[PDB]
Ligand SMILES: CCCCCCCCCCCC(=O)OC[C@H](COP(=O)(O)OCC[N+](C)(C)C)OC(=O)CCCCCCCCCCC
């Protein structure tokens with residue numbers, strides 16, 4: 364059952380668009396008149412008011428779009444509109460680091476309707492974004508390599524159509540938590556998959572099952588690089604009780620959204636944050652997440668850790684294989700950037716039972732004490748742990764050690780650290796030494812060695 | 813977390829609710845929600861009677877150095893910086 368439109372072509376409910384296990388219902392895209400896609404242009408010139416544009420020379424000509432800079436299209440998902448503040452705020456962040464044509468794609472006439480129909484309307488949106496990219500190339504000789512399509516959830520698959528239709532020539536697509544229902548498990552046609560663009564990178568933040576767990580994003584790997592922050596299933600900050608979740612640090616709206624879809628919306632908050640933290644979301648290649656937390660995937664390889672987000676395209680190995688998984692950890696609330704360190708403590712003093720904590724000191728800053736070990740503290744054993752500092756402390760100048768236990772032992776024992784070694788995510792190792800042991804709750808400074 | 817063992821960011825009426833024993837808020841009529849104990853070289857308040865902080869107290873081994881003695885600051889503004897002793 365085909366449905367053809369002028370400029371966009373025909374749409375048919377044939378397999379695999381309908382009638383597969385994953386997509387039973389035979390539904391067609393609406394529209395084009397109804398979905399009603401609009402390109403709301405924001406540029407460094409006009410950072411605050413978009414100017415609506417279209418695929419015709421008098422619109423591109425009459426606006427701040429410059430063919431001399433890159434074009435980053437942001438596509439939203441189910442239920443949003445392109446006027447939602449997170450699309451404008453990816454732009455507001457992009458302008459701090461570049462001259463870019465930021466086109467927010469609004470398709471709310473097709474997104475505020477039943478999910479099964481919003482999954483099909485995607486097709487008109489991808490068709491609509493392709494035509495504008497085709498037209499920048501025909502009219503203004505602007506190569507698809509300059510185009511980046513950032514699409515969140517159902518918008519990630521919209522991006523995947525855009526690239527499919529320009530087959531593979533667009534620069535990159537960034538699928539931010541691609542929607543799982545009606546896509547996970549289906550062929551490359553019907554979804555975002557590494558072939559729809561020259562580079563595809565994904566951020567996975569809700570990889571749980573839609574039923575039973577109401578995990579909106581997908582767990583499957585659809586990009587050259589697929590990043591799984593906090594292991595991609597459950598995000599820090601998202602398990603806050605409904606009243607402090609809705610009542611947010613500003614926004615009943617941003618609160619309500621996170622009550623409804625926290626994890627799933629965390630993907631564009633990490634991306635938005637990466638723009639201005641260019642080293643702050645390093646990606647550790649690992650067999651899994653459980654291994655990464657087993658302290659077995661650090662540091663980065665001589666090669667590098669890709670940055671999750673806006674600078675993943677700076678990763679040298681980026682298109683070397685499809686579906687490469689990177690694990691990493693972020694913050695619970697904004698400024699999600701974290702800097703993982705590894706620390707090995709070699710103990711001295713009396714065998715006691717405690718917690719040992721470390722603090723790092725470097726030229727750029729210092730840190731929270733992190734816990735490296737809690738257990739039998741036997742002298743001469745070593746104990747390492749990796750941890751996501753919230754501060755990149757620079758080059759290490761000092762490290763201070765402190766322990767405490769739960770039960771007061773009147774023998775009054777003293778424990779210390781003869782050698783602590785901090786290793787950075789690149790592998791820089793800094794060694795520190797001290798011959799002193801200290802009491803419970805006293806802070807042992809260790810100096811360079 | 814629900815009404816005790818509150819995670820940082822959970823709305824808070826008294827610091828013992830919070831896992832970090834620190835309920836804090838920027839200003840006076842501000843919603844109080846669980847936060848950090850302060851680290852070395854960040855501002856801090858000394859432990860108070862009042863229940864929620866404007867500046868959390870320090871990590872262990874650390875001393876919030878400022879002028880405590882003052883009744884008045886021993887009310888809500890007993891602030892300091894976390895020094896190791
Ligand atoms: C149970 C089966 C449902 C099937 C659909 C599941 C989603 C799968 C694809 C991912 C969705 C996507 O593309 O990202 C789109 C996201 C998430 O929408 P959602 O994930 O559907 O959340 C499900 C709940 N809703 C349907 C209500 C969204 O935008 C959002 O901020 C959703 C925020 C809506 C906030 C509720 C506000 C109420 C009004 C304002 C009060 C002042």
Ligand SMILES: [Ca+2]
Pocket residue numbers: 523524527550551552553554555556559
């Ligand atoms: Ca595809």
